[PDB]
Design a protein around this ligand. Structure first.
Ligand SMILES: *[C@H](O)[C@H](C[C@@H]1CCNC1=O)NC(=O)[C@H](CC1CCCCC1)NC(=O)[C@@H](NC(=O)OCc1cccc(Cl)c1)[C@@H](C)OC(C)(C)C
Ligand SMILES: *[C@H](O)[C@H](C[C@@H]1CCNC1=O)NC(=O)[C@H](CC1CCCCC1)NC(=O)[C@@H](NC(=O)OCc1cccc(Cl)c1)[C@@H](C)OC(C)(C)C
Lengths: 306, 306
């Protein structure tokens, strides 16, 4: 028993991280087979930050302008191209540690593990969710760009995030590994703001099921509610609408605990309306929304990865 | 900016995990050089759980009773010995992935990363602290015994925990890697209980400094307090005494933020006495105590590991 924000083991991703240096800018890159992926703003200069034309910027560059370092071994760049907001550096050496991998663009509400890196060296790993406003509440300092977020499915690493920038509110913006930003953000030094965030309702319900699996039942009740009437309460408290498709995803957890989905909704309703009254759930005094139904089942059941 | 429960990258430890099977018991082992470490209760049988004599149990065993599996490759046991509550299985193959490593016995209040494993396969990684009562609030199911907890210092993995058992309150008990239990626990199936826990005061203060580093100051005040008068408040709220040595460890954080240690103590005093009044600190509505001063400096500054 017990319940923790669990990240995936990071070994398979640690073996892919490299240092990419260009001009006075150093950040991280992801070395898969003979390609190194990294944010295109590596080619920006301190006076280019404001409104760069990366097409102009890149056609002025040579391969030897890109210092790529894999540990104590420098990799030679033999080609470069830009795809959306990511740079792809063709190198002469294939990474022998390249895992089986996929690139995936995730939906808001999905969670992933971030391997925070600096200078091609992993610093730490933690768990994030893609917020409904397409930011992530990460932990990122200067030098961390090009750190990736990922999920592991048996032996396959699904890369879903690459870090690019920090917004004034202290949340983080980035792209998928094909360089498309999550959300309306752009890699320009211009006034941009998160957008109003909302709480991920389906995830909070997953976490309440995790609490029941783990022996907290103080928040249950005998009441129930309709999906319509639940969503009328949610919108008041700035939660996302719960869809029937969400209900269905919560099927297994409902079946394993014997608590109908809409019965858990009535519990959440009263928690929203009355607060927790000095009590905690899974060691939290807030309603937690960065575990998906899948995360709960993985951790409360014991799924591993080779 | 941002602040997350960060675990260490787990790659170096993932390469050391193996499956150890004996009789009807399967758990994890740690393969370093030509030795596999694992809990001695692997030799227990379902009727031995109650009060085993492991010396008797072990002298009845043969090397070929120990199934050790490293992925799809079985390792041959060529010797075995017991050290305190851990078994050391001598194998004929040295692990080529053996990192530079140390075994260390940590003090309560120190944090570490746990690589939760099942069947020799890592499932996930999360961050724990050794509670003042020498339990850990882990996340562990059947099969997880022999999962290790660890810290990384540049390139060196310091192993500090190996998982053995779960207590009725749902917290977890285990040993250092030389087999000495943390706390008064024993590997017998007998009535044992955690002991009253307390909050790790020096860590809460470290976390409040992390919040200031990250832009929350709502909880500060102009007051101050003496160490004596602070500790008189702490004991009332079931916090551990703050020592002058704790004050000294908080020196750098005090210096980087400009907030004298005892000034932060006066903030904690009023948070203890008035609660947070619907506000949060670093996304928590509770006072967080599982970041050490060192953890805060590592994450707010950017230290990595090769
Ligand atoms: C990559 O190592 C670095 C990682 C950042 C630094 C701090 N934490 C992080 O996550 N990324 C950047 O520094 C990034 C650089 C590129 C270069 C030009 C093209 C896009 C950005 N810059 C930022 O993250 C800045 N954020 C930002 O520009 O947000 C939009 C914006 C632009 C202009 C004005 C405003 Cl008010 C807002 C960060 C460094 O700036 C602040 C944190 C101060 C907002
Ligand atoms: C190893 O894979 C496993 C990991 C446990 C299972 C569930 N979560 C975990 O962390 N460890 C055990 O199952 C361990 C087995 C050894 C075998 C004999 C020698 C010591 C224990 N058993 C336990 O963890 C049990 N806990 C326990 O025995 O606590 C002290 C105790 C003993 C007797 C009676 C009581 Cl009331 C308390 C667990 C499995 O038992 C409960 C979780 C039900 C307390």
């Amino acid at each position: 028993s017990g319940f923790r924000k669990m990240a995936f083991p990071s070994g398979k991703v640690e073996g892919c991280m490299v240092q990419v240096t260009c001009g006075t800018t150093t950040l991280n890159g992801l070395w898969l087979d003979d390609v190194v992926y990294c944010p295109r703003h590596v080619i920006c200069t301190s006076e280019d930050m404001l409104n760069p034309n990366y097409e102009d910027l890149l056609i002025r560059k040579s391969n030897h302008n890109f210092l790529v370092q894999a540990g104590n071994v420098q990799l030679r760049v033999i080609g470069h191209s830009m795809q959306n907001c990511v740079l792809k550096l063709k190198v002469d050496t294939a990474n022998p540690k390249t895992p089986k991998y996929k690139f995936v663009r995730i939906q808001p509400g999905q969670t992933f593990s971030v391997l925070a890196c600096y200078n091609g060296s992993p610093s730490g790993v933690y768990q994030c969710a893609m917020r409904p406003n397409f930011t992530i509440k990460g932990s990122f300092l200067n030098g961390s760009c090009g750190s990736v977020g990922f999920n592991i499915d048996y032996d396959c690493v699904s890369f879903c995030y690459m870090h690019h920038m920090e917004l004034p509110t202290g949340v983080h913006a980035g792209t998928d590994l094909a360089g498309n930003f999550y959300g309306p953000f752009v890699d320009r030094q211009t006034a941009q703001a998160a957008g109003t965030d909302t709480t991920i309702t389906v995830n909070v319900l997953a976490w309440l099921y995790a609490a029941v699996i783990n022996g907290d039942r103080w928040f249950l009740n005998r009441f129930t509610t309709t999906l319509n009437d639940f969503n009328l309460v949610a919108m008041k408290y700035n939660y996302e609408p719960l869809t029937q498709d969400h209900v269905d995803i919560l099927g297994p957890l409902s079946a394993q605990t014997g608590i109908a989905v809409l019965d858990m909704c009535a519990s959440l309703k009263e928690l929203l309306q009355n607060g927790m009254n000095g009590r905690t759930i899974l060691g939290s005094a807030l309603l937690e929304d960065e575990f998906t139904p899948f995360d709960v089942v993985r951790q409360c059941s014991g799924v591993t990865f080779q």
